[PDB]
Design a protein around this ligand. Structure first.
Ligand SMILES: Nc1nc(Nc2ccc(C(=O)O)cc2)sc1C(=O)c1cccnc1
Length: 294
């Protein structure tokens, strides 16, 4: 790009490609996201233009928004690594619990902030959580289903991940609440702890049944109204709920208790980011620094 000397391609999100680039003028290194078409709507440019004011230590700062030629460019502060790479890098030893706790705590602060401002992320996943050498972790991407709406893929033939999708979404609820972000964060928390995706579905139905096999097929008792959901079918198999101690060993009881609250089927029962920050699990929370290999 004329103003940016693209360093490299560091990703290809569900909306566009992300590049590491240097402002030929300021010399600042940033993350430049190219957005995907036939004119680029204005309702979105506003939704986006609104994000620039959403500043918090646990939210990646959106520096500039540039609309030009069917392509929208989002300029973000650059962070050196994402949680997916860090988890892969920590696979053999596991991320130390104090760091897992710090990361969870910070992301909940980020979400509490977003949610208090009625902003929903909607697509939390390891690849959308960025970390630095200082021990911070920030929410990135935020998708844009409200400012657009996930079509059929990312933008150019790429398998979207369903692993962190809340059940109400999979069951066709058209109106997501902040609860979907807590569910996703719950899934990531479990994954950091066990070093294995909690619900690695490879299709919407497989994702749904993996959740059902583990947490039990929901019914009107645990989730009032579930049998009325758009994609609910009486023919869904009926699996019993598995014991939580088998789901995330060796997470301690405080952690398991918090996780169960983040994974309640009923969105209305699911814990809020604000309430989660008060959970006993965070009593001894600290801010360790990660060992990042850049
Ligand atoms: N600001 C920002 N910084 C990133 N850094 C890296 C990310 C990954 C790696 C890596 O895998 O080595 C290095 C730096 S990615 C990113 C984004 O704002 C973003 C993330 C995901 C989707 N869309 C935009």
């Amino acid at each position: 790009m004329e103003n940016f000397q693209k360093v490299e391609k560091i990703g290809e999100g569900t909306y566009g490609v992300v590049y590491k680039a240097r402002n030929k003028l300021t010399g600042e290194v940033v993350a430049l996201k190219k957005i995907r078409t036939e004119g680029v709507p204005s309702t979105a440019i506003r939704e986006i233009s609104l994000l620039k004011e959403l500043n918090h230590p646990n939210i990646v700062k959106l520096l500039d928004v540039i609309h030009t030629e069917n392509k929208l460019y989002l300029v973000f502060e650059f962070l050196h690594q994402d949680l997916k790479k860090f988890m892969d890098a920590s696979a053999l030893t596991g991320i130390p619990l104090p760091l897992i706790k710090s990361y969870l705590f910070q992301l909940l602060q980020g979400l509490a902030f977003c949610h208090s401002h009625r902003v929903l992320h909607r697509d939390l996943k390891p690849q959308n959580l960025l970390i630095n050498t200082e021990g911070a972790i920030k929410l990135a991407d935020f998708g844009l289903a409200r400012a657009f709406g996930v079509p059929v893929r990312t933008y150019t033939h790429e398998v979207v991940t369903l692993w962190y999708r809340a059940p109400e979404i999979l069951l066709g609820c058209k109106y997501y609440s902040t609860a979907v972000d807590i569910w996703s964060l719950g899934c990531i928390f479990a994954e950091m702890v066990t070093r294995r995706a909690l619900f690695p579905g490879d299709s919407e139905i497989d994702q749904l049944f993996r959740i059902f096999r583990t947490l039990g097929t929901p019914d009107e008792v645990v989730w009032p109204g579930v049998t009325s959901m758009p994609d609910y079918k009486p023919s869904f198999p009926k699996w019993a709920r598995q014991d939580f101690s088998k789901v995330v060993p060796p997470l301690d009881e405080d952690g398991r208790s918090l996780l169960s609250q983040m994974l309640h089927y009923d969105p209305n029962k699911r814990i809020s980011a604000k309430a989660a920050l008060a959970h006993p699990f965070f009593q001894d929370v600290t801010k360790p620094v990660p060992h990042l290999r850049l």
